[PDB]
C-alpha cells in the first residue's frame, strides 16, 4: 500500500492540481496600459529523496531508522516537484477576445514541498535493499518486518480503517414511523477527481398500506426531493413508456409498472425537458441564479454533481438515466420483497483503507492547502508590488507538519486513533498490531458480529473483550488488501470483446442481456456473458489482468461486476478444473508444481526460481475476495472432496457435501486464523471465547520482541 502510494498516488495528486493560473487585469484608466497578464505556475514530475535528516546547523545527512529511533527524529524523506513558470501578456482591447502569448520568461528546477514520512522496509527505505548482514551492521533486527513509521522516535503503525464501499447501490428498509418505506442510496465517489462524496438517495414514500406511493430522489445541491419522472425528463427521456423501459426491464412485470404508475401521476404535468430542468433549477439551493439561467444551472447539476462516479462530462445523460432506472429497479425489487435489503455487514461491500489511501487523502488535503497558500502569496505579491520568492510561495512546513502531526497523533485531519504506537511486547504482538484493522462505529447495523463473509479474510477469534469487540478485527494469515488498478484497460477490453455501449441499449429487444458493471459503473450489456467471463478469468489466471481484480458473474440477476479499486480484502484459493484425463474435478496444482516450490525453497535455504508469483502466473491459485466468494464453490481439502466416493472412530466426523461441482479449494483451513490465533495449539478443540481470550493475552506475554 505504501509502495503504491509513493510510486503513483503522489504523482497523481500533483498532476490533478498541477497548474495554477492568476490573471492580472489591465485596470487601465488610460489606453497606454491596455495589457492583461496571465501568470501560471505549473507542477510537473515529483521526486522523492532517500530518507534524510537536516540538523540545526543546516547539515543534511542520510537518516537511518536506528538513528531516528535513538534521536527521536522522524524517519522521513524530502519531496520535490518540478515547477515551470509560464507568463503571458495580451492586448486588453474591450470587445475583442484576449489572445495570450509567451514573453519567453519560461523559467523551470526542483523545489522542496515537504518531508514524507517513510514506512520502514518500503521501496524508499534503506532497509529494503539491505541484506541480513547489512541489517546487522545497521543494528536492525532481520526478524523485524517493517510496516510502521518512525515519528519523533516512536514506532507508529497505521491501523487499517474499515469503510463501506462507494459506488454501490444499497437499498434499506426504514422504520415504521417514517413516511419513507425504502431508501436506495449510493455514496458516489470518484478516484481520479476531486474525491468528494455525493450521496444520491432514491426514496419510496408511503408505507405498504398506503396508496400514493411515489418515488423521489435527493439530487445534490437541490433543497427538495425531486420526483424521478421529473429527473428522467430533465435528463432527456420524456415518454412514460421510455421511462418505464429505463426503470423496468420486463414487459410482464406489471407489479413494478403498477408501483411506477403514481410516479408518472406525480410527474405528469411536466412533459418537457426544459420544464423539468426549470423545476430542478427552481429547487436549486444556491439562490443566486437569475430567471433565465436556471436551465443551465440544472444541467450543470445533472452533469457535474448527479452521479459523478459515472462521469463528469456532458453527453452521458442516457448513461446516468439508465443508472437511475437501475437504482429505482433495485428499490422496487426490495419493495416487492423479491430481494431483501442489502446486508450492511457483508465484507465484500466493505473497503479497508491502508497506509496508501489514508496518506493519499491526507496528502491531497495538505496539497490543496499548499496550492491555496501559493495562490494567496502570489496574489499578495502581485497586488502589493512585492518581489516574488518561491521559497516563500511554498511553505514546506505545511506538508511536513501535517503528515507528522497526523502520524504522531491519530487524528486524521487538519477520525481518531488511526495511527497507534506500535506494540513491541512480543514478536507476535507486533505482527498482530501490524495486521490489525479498525471499524468506526452510529447506524442500524450489527457490525460487532462475526459475519459469514469474514471467512478467510479476518480472524474468527481475535478481538478485544471491551468496547472494541467486533469493531477491531485482525487479518487472516493469507488475506491481502488490493492496492487498486486502472479500470480503463478492462473497460476498453470489454468494449472490443463485445460489451455494447449503454447508449444503444434497448431493454425490450435484449431481454437476456447481462448488465456489465466496472467498479460500480454500468458500462453496457453483453449478449453472451459466459464466454466473456471465461476469457476474462483466463486473462487473470495467466496474469494479463491484475490478479487483484475481482470478477463476479451473478447469473440469476444477469450481472457481471468487475472491481479494480483498492481496499478489497481477498484471499488465495486453489483452482479446480474439469481435468478430462482423469474424468473428475481436480486441483490444477500438482506434485510437480509442489516439487518446484520445494526446490526453490531449499535453494533459498541451480534450478529455476519457482515462486508464488509463478503459481499465480500459470494460474494454479486465484485471488478471491468476499464478493467473488459468492459465486464460487470451495472444497475444504483436496484429497477428500475432489475424488469420487471403515473409518477411524477417533477422527472427527466430516461430511463430503455430496456435491462434485467445485471451482475452488481451500489451501489450508488453518489460514482463516490470524497471527495471535495461529499460536493457539489445537484451537478447534477449544471453546471459541477461550481462543479469543488467548488471542488477547498472547500480546501480553514475555519473549524476545526483537533481537536488537
Amino acid at each position: 500500500s505504501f509502495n503504491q502510494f509513493v510510486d503513483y498516488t503522489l504523482q497523481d495528486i500533483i498532476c490533478e492540481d498541477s497548474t495554477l493560473i492568476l490573471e492580472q487585469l489591465a485596470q487601465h484608466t488610460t489606453e497606454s496600459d491596455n495589457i492583461s497578464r496571465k501568470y501560471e505556475i505549473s507542477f510537473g514530475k515529483i521526486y522523492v529523496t532517500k530518507p534524510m535528516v537536516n540538523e540545526s546547523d543546516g547539515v543534511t545527512h542520510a537518516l537511518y531508522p536506528q538513528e531516528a529511533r535513538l534521536r527521536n527524529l522522524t524517519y522521513s524523506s524530502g519531496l520535490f516537484v518540478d515547477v515551470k513558470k509560464r507568463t503571458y501578456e495580451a492586448i486588453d482591447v474591450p470587445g475583442r477576445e484576449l489572445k495570450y502569448e509567451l514573453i519567453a520568461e519560461e523559467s523551470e528546477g526542483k523545489v522542496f514541498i515537504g518531508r514524507l514520512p517513510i514506512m520502514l522496509r518500503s521501496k524508499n527505505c534503506y532497509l529494503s535493499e539491505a541484506t541480513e548482514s547489512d541489517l546487522y551492521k545497521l543494528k536492525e533486527c532481520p526478524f523485524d518486518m517493517g510496516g510502521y513509521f518512525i515519528i519523533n522516535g516512536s514506532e507508529k503503525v497505521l491501523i487499517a480503517q474499515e469503510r463501506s464501499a462507494g459506488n454501490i447501490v444499497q437499498v434499506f428498509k426504514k422504520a415504521a414511523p417514517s413516511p419513507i418505506s425504502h431508501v436506495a442510496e449510493i455514496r458516489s465517489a470518484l478516484e481520479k477527481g476531486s474525491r468528494f462524496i455525493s450521496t444520491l438517495q432514491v426514496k419510496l414514500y408511503g408505507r405498504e398500506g398506503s396508496s400514493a406511493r411515489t418515488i423521489k430522489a435527493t439530487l445534490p445541491y437541490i433543497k427538495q426531493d425531486i420526483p424521478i419522472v421529473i429527473i428522467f425528463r430533465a435528463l432527456g427521456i420524456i415518454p412514460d413508456g421510455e421511462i418505464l423501459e429505463h426503470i423496468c426491464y420486463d414487459v410482464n412485470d406489471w407489479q413494478m409498472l403498477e408501483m411506477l404508475k403514481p410516479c408518472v401521476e406525480d410527474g405528469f404535468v411536466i412533459q418537457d425537458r426544459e420544464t423539468a430542468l426549470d423545476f430542478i433549477g427552481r429547487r436549486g439551493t444556491a439562490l443566486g441564479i437569475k430567471k433565465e439561467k436556471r436551465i443551465q444551472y440544472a444541467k450543470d447539476i445533472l452533469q457535474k454533481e448527479f452521479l459523478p462516479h459515472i462521469t463528469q462530462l456532458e453527453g452521458f445523460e442516457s448513461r446516468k438515466a439508465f443508472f437511475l432506472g437501475y437504482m429505482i429497479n433495485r428499490l422496487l425489487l426490495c419493495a416487492l420483497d423479491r430481494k431483501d435489503q442489502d446486508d450492511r455487514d457483508h465484507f465484500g461491500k466493505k473497503r479497508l483503507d491502508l497506509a496508501g489511501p489514508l496518506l493519499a487523502q491526507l496528502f491531497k488535503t495538505l496539497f490543496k492547502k499548499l496550492t491555496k497558500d501559493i495562490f494567496r502569496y502570489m496574489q499578495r505579491t502581485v497586488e502589493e508590488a512585492h518581489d516574488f520568492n518561491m521559497k516563500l510561495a511554498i511553505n514546506a512546513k505545511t506538508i511536513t507538519s501535517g503528515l507528522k502531526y497526523a502520524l504522531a497523533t491519530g487524528n486524521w485531519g487538519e477520525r481518531a486513533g488511526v495511527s497507534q504506537v506500535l506494540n513491541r511486547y512480543t514478536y507476535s504482538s507486533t505482527l498482530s498490531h501490524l495486521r490489525r484493522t479498525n471499524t468506526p462505529i452510529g447506524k442500524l447495523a450489527k457490525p460487532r458480529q462475526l459475519h459469514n463473509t469474514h471467512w478467510g479474510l479476518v480472524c474468527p477469534a481475535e478481538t478485544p473483550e471491551g468496547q472494541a469487540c467486533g469493531l477491531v478485527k485482525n487479518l487472516s494469515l493469507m488475506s491481502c488488501i488490493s492496492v487498486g488498478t486502472d479500470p480503463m484497460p478492462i473497460i476498453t477490453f470489454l468494449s472490443e470483446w463485445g460489451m455494447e455501449p449503454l447508449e444503444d441499449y434497448v431493454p425490450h429487444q435484449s431481454p437476456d442481456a447481462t448488465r456489465v458493471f466496472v467498479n460500480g459503473v454500468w458500462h453496457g450489456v453483453h449478449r453472451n456473458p459466459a464466454r466473456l467471463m471465461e476469457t476474462l478469468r483466463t486473462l487473470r489466471r495467466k496474469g494479463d489482468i491484475n490478479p487483484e481484480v475481482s470478477m463476479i458473474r451473478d447469473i440469476r440477476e444477469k450481472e457481471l461486476k468487475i472491481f479494480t479499486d483498492a481496499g478489497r480484502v481477498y484471499r488465495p484459493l486453489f483452482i479446480v478444473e474439469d481435468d478430462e484425463s482423469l474424468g473428475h474435478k481436480e486441483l490444477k496444482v500438482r506434485k510437480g508444481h509442489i516439487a518446484k516450490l520445494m526446490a526453490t525453497e531449499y535453494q533459498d535455504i541451480d534450478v529455476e526460481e519457482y515462486t508464488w508469483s509463478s503459481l499465480l502466473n500459470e494460474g494454479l491459485v486465484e485471488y478471491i475476495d468476499a464478493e467473488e466468494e459468492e459465486s464460487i464453490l470451495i472444497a475444504m481439502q483436496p484429497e477428500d472432496l475432489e475424488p469420487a466416493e471403515d473409518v477411524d472412530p477417533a477422527k472427527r466426523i466430516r461430511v463430503s457435501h455430496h456435491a462434485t461441482t467445485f471451482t475452488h479449494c481451500e489451501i489450508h483451513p488453518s489460514m482463516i486464523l490470524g497471527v495471535a490465533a495461529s499460536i493457539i495449539p489445537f484451537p478447534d478443540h477449544n471453546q471459541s471465547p477461550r481462543n479469543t481470550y488467548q488471542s488477547a493475552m498472547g500480546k501480553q506475554a514475555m519473549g524476545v520482541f526483537l533481537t536488537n
Partner: peptide, 24 residues
C-alpha cells in the same frame, strides 16, 4: 502511559451510558 489488552472494566463509569441515553 499504558496499553493493555486485559479489559479491566472502568468502574464508576456510568456517565457514558447517561450521555448515550439522555432523552426519554
Amino acid at each position: 502511559n499504558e496499553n493493555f489488552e486485559d479489559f479491566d472494566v472502568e468502574h464508576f463509569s456510568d456517565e457514558e451510558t447517561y450521555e448515550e441515553k439522555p432523552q426519554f
